[PDB]
């Protein structure tokens, strides 16, 4: 029972560290969107950062 409680506590810490990881209201790692596209050239073409759900 002690080991099981330790395991659940570590799991909750993972959920917290993952959900809290934001910058300016958007996140590449919380899984809230498929991808993130940043400006790449004056023409308007975009650099693409595919999201990674931690």
């Amino acid at each position: 029972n002690a080991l099981k409680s330790d395991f659940d506590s570590l799991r909750d810490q993972i959920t917290k560290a993952a959900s809290n990881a934001k910058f300016n209201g958007v996140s590449i790692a919380n899984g809230s969107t498929a991808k993130l596209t940043f400006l790449a050239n004056s023409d308007g073409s975009g650099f693409t950062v595919t999201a990674k759900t931690l």
Binding site: N20, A21, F23, N24
Partner: protein
Amino acid sequence: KLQDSLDAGVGNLVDADLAKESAKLQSLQTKQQLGVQALSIANSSSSAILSLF
């Protein structure tokens, strides 16, 4: 660690690159001095008229 990362992020957003600023500063002071000299030469243009009489 989270606070440090958010601080570094805002720092990338707002901070200026001081070296480019100093280069722009030297170029701008030289431009201003040459502009003052140009304004003086422009003010002097009227002087030629007087010798006509």
